[PDB]
Enzyme design. Structure first.
Site, PDB file in Angstrom:
ATOM      1  N   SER A   1      21.295 -22.950 -12.080  1.00 46.27           N
ATOM      2  CA  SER A   1      20.331 -21.878 -11.901  1.00 46.27           C
ATOM      3  C   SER A   1      19.021 -22.188 -12.622  1.00 46.27           C
ATOM      4  CB  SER A   1      20.919 -20.539 -12.358  1.00 46.27           C
ATOM      5  OG  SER A   1      21.514 -20.650 -13.637  1.00 46.27           O
TER       6      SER A   1
ATOM      7  N   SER B   1      18.474 -25.793 -13.531  1.00 47.21           N
ATOM      8  CA  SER B   1      18.425 -27.253 -13.529  1.00 47.21           C
ATOM      9  C   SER B   1      18.970 -27.874 -12.244  1.00 47.21           C
ATOM     10  CB  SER B   1      19.205 -27.804 -14.724  1.00 47.21           C
ATOM     11  OG  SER B   1      20.561 -27.386 -14.675  1.00 47.21           O
TER      12      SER B   1
ATOM     13  N   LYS C   1      19.867 -34.933 -15.273  1.00 45.51           N
ATOM     14  CA  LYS C   1      19.634 -33.503 -15.246  1.00 45.51           C
ATOM     15  C   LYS C   1      18.158 -33.293 -15.470  1.00 45.51           C
ATOM     16  CE  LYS C   1      21.354 -29.242 -17.291  1.00 45.51           C
ATOM     17  NZ  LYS C   1      22.526 -28.692 -18.029  1.00 45.51           N
TER      18      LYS C   1
ATOM     19  N   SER D   1      25.922 -39.698 -18.251  1.00 43.05           N
ATOM     20  CA  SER D   1      26.867 -40.524 -17.525  1.00 43.05           C
ATOM     21  C   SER D   1      27.223 -39.829 -16.224  1.00 43.05           C
ATOM     22  CB  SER D   1      28.116 -40.821 -18.358  1.00 43.05           C
ATOM     23  OG  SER D   1      28.610 -39.644 -18.952  1.00 43.05           O
ATOM     24  N   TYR D   2      27.427 -40.639 -15.192  1.00 46.82           N
ATOM     25  CA  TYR D   2      27.733 -40.176 -13.846  1.00 46.82           C
ATOM     26  C   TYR D   2      29.233 -40.078 -13.637  1.00 46.82           C
ATOM     27  CZ  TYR D   2      27.980 -40.397  -8.714  1.00 46.82           C
ATOM     28  OH  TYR D   2      28.240 -40.187  -7.381  1.00 46.82           O
ATOM     29  N   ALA D   3      29.752 -38.867 -13.478  1.00 47.04           N
ATOM     30  CA  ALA D   3      31.162 -38.719 -13.162  1.00 47.04           C
ATOM     31  C   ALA D   3      31.309 -38.698 -11.652  1.00 47.04           C
ATOM     32  CB  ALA D   3      31.717 -37.445 -13.773  1.00 47.04           C
TER      33      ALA D   3
ATOM     34  N   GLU E   1      33.939 -32.368  -9.932  1.00 44.08           N
ATOM     35  CA  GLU E   1      34.655 -31.437 -10.805  1.00 44.08           C
ATOM     36  C   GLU E   1      36.129 -31.249 -10.497  1.00 44.08           C
ATOM     37  OE1 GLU E   1      31.511 -28.707 -10.724  1.00 44.08           O
ATOM     38  OE2 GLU E   1      32.314 -27.446  -9.108  1.00 44.08           O
TER      39      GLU E   1
ATOM     40  N   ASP F   1      32.447 -22.545 -22.930  1.00 41.93           N
ATOM     41  CA  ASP F   1      32.415 -22.397 -21.472  1.00 41.93           C
ATOM     42  C   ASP F   1      33.328 -23.438 -20.844  1.00 41.93           C
ATOM     43  OD1 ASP F   1      31.699 -21.006 -19.202  1.00 41.93           O
ATOM     44  OD2 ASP F   1      29.795 -22.097 -18.913  1.00 41.93           O
TER      45      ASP F   1
ATOM     46  N   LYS G   1      36.003 -24.686 -18.548  1.00 48.00           N
ATOM     47  CA  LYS G   1      36.518 -24.248 -17.250  1.00 48.00           C
ATOM     48  C   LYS G   1      36.535 -25.436 -16.304  1.00 48.00           C
ATOM     49  CE  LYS G   1      31.950 -22.589 -15.786  1.00 48.00           C
ATOM     50  NZ  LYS G   1      31.274 -21.507 -15.015  1.00 48.00           N
TER      51      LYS G   1
ATOM     52  N   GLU H   1      35.215 -26.107 -13.576  1.00 51.96           N
ATOM     53  CA  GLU H   1      33.900 -26.498 -13.066  1.00 51.96           C
ATOM     54  C   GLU H   1      33.168 -27.386 -14.064  1.00 51.96           C
ATOM     55  OE1 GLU H   1      35.269 -23.387 -12.880  1.00 51.96           O
ATOM     56  OE2 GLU H   1      34.072 -22.090 -11.524  1.00 51.96           O
ATOM     57  N   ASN H   2      33.541 -27.265 -15.335  1.00 52.06           N
ATOM     58  CA  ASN H   2      32.890 -28.011 -16.410  1.00 52.06           C
ATOM     59  C   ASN H   2      33.685 -29.216 -16.886  1.00 52.06           C
ATOM     60  OD1 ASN H   2      30.558 -26.551 -16.475  1.00 52.06           O
ATOM     61  ND2 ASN H   2      31.182 -25.189 -18.139  1.00 52.06           N
TER      62      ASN H   2
ATOM     63  N   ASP I   1      28.466 -29.681 -19.897  1.00 55.09           N
ATOM     64  CA  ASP I   1      27.883 -28.339 -20.032  1.00 55.09           C
ATOM     65  C   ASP I   1      27.869 -27.814 -21.467  1.00 55.09           C
ATOM     66  OD1 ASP I   1      26.554 -26.101 -19.196  1.00 55.09           O
ATOM     67  OD2 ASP I   1      28.351 -25.037 -18.513  1.00 55.09           O
TER      68      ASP I   1
ATOM     69  N   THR J   1      32.086 -17.800 -19.110  1.00 55.93           N
ATOM     70  CA  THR J   1      32.371 -17.388 -17.746  1.00 55.93           C
ATOM     71  C   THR J   1      33.513 -16.380 -17.776  1.00 55.93           C
ATOM     72  OG1 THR J   1      31.614 -19.510 -16.868  1.00 55.93           O
ATOM     73  CG2 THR J   1      33.052 -18.192 -15.445  1.00 55.93           C
TER      74      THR J   1
END
Ligand SMILES: Nc1ncnc2c1ncn2[C@@H]1O[C@H](COP(=O)(O)OP(=O)(O)OP(=O)(O)O)[C@@H](O)[C@H]1O
Ligand SMILES: O=C(O)C[C@@H](Cc1nc2cc(Cl)ccc2[nH]1)c1ccc(Cl)cc1
Ligand SMILES: [Cl-]
Ligand SMILES: [Cl-]
Ligand SMILES: [Cl-]
Ligand SMILES: [Cl-]
Ligand SMILES: [Cl-]
Ligand SMILES: [Cl-]
Ligand SMILES: [Cl-]
Ligand SMILES: [Cl-]
Length: 283
Positions: free
Chosen positions: A17, A19, A36, A85-87, A91, A130, A132, A134-135, A148, A170
């Site tokens: 929201s 970035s 980012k 670093s690129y994961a 997720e 945070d 979760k 998603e993170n 995050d 969250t």
């Protein structure tokens, strides 16, 4: 300092929201990074600056295989850039949705990696706040990469600080103490861990509702249940983490820390010492 022109930018990896994360290749080395990017005007205008400084400060303190690494930062007239670093595998949530429910081996493996990560994080006196799916990102080897950190908190060793006052997180994963005492502690991440374990086996997190307020009401009453076929030892672990009293959660400082957590029968088969060099089980 690197500069924007040092990179070839590719696809957007994600949009927040405040970035955007874009895949970039460093021209001099051919290395790939997740960059980012934040617009200064927007950040300043919508006062998200504190989130930005916090993210950089916290990530700068972390050096562990199970966390996204901040390699570099630079800026230009309009934007801030975090070289991360690129994961490649995105997720964990994506896999939960696509698979529905992890088997016991995969649940245990990924739980163990998250436990390992939290032990490191809490050892540095940092609360994530945070945590979760998603993170929790997955690298090209399918090991976790936790990300995050704009809402994380570095607790002060000088004042033996154990509680933090910022309201962040969250709803599904927020701890009861944040809702009722208006503060979070390292133990709040153990609450989130319980929620995540439950979600890995059940498919959905334990406190489910269509809106935040309803979720909040269930969390404070510990209103949840297990589906049938929930692995017994995982259930026992979840019940020791989803405890209203934050000083009674397995893993917390008041319960003598990570030793007793890592010793839970659920982890009996786990070799803690070289997790990050083990081949993860196939989902
Ligand atoms: N290091 C990374 N490698 C690969 N993908 C990433 C990485 N960091 C973030 N992403 C992807 O970008 C998406 C959102 O990124 P970003 O952190 O900019 O926003 P957010 O934190 O999800 O949202 P908000 O800005 O509201 O907090 C995530 O869903 C994730 O899939
Ligand atoms: C240095 C600290 C800093 N934070 C800022 C916020 C805004 Cl809006 C504008 C300029 C700023 N410089 C800095 C912090 C993070 C990054 Cl990614 C790059 C540089
Ligand atoms: Cl750009
Ligand atoms: Cl590219
Ligand atoms: Cl790299
Ligand atoms: Cl750096
Ligand atoms: Cl919230
Ligand atoms: Cl219950
Ligand atoms: Cl048991
Ligand atoms: Cl270890």
């Amino acid at each position: 300092k690197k500069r924007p022109e040092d990179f070839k930018f590719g696809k957007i990896l994600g949009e927040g929201s405040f970035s955007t994360v874009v895949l970039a290749r460093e021209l001099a080395t051919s290395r790939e990074y997740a960059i980012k990017i934040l617009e200064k005007r927007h950040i300043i205008k919508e006062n998200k600056v504190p989130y930005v400084t916090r993210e950089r400060d916290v990530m700068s303190r972390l050096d562990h295989p199970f966390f996204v690494k901040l390699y570099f930062t630079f800026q230009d007239d309009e934007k801030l850039y975090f070289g991360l670093s690129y994961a490649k595998n995105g997720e964990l949530l994506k896999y939960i949705r696509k698979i529905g429910s992890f088997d016991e081996t995969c649940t245990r493996f990924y739980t163990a990696e998250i436990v390992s990560a939290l032990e490191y994080l809490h050892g540095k006196g940092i609360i994530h706040r945070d945590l979760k799916p998603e993170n929790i990102l997955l690298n090209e080897d399918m090991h976790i990469q936790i990300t995050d950190f704009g809402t994380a908190k570095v607790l002060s060793p000088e004042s033996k600080q154990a509680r933090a006052n910022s309201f962040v997180g969250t709803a599904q994963y927020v701890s009861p103490e944040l809702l009722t005492e208006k503060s979070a502690c390292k133990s709040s991440d153990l609450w989130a861990l319980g929620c995540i374990i439950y979600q890995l086996v059940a498919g959905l997190p334990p406190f489910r509702a269509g809106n935040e307020g309803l979720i909040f009401a269930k969390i404070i009453k510990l209103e949840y249940d297990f589906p049938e076929k929930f692995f017994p030892k995982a259930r026992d672990l979840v019940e020791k983490l989803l405890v209203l009293d934050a000083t009674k959660r397995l893993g917390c400082e008041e319960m003598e820390g990570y030793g007793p957590l890592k010793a839970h029968p659920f982890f009996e088969s786990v070799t803690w010492e070289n997790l990050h060099q083990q081949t993860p089980p196939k989902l």
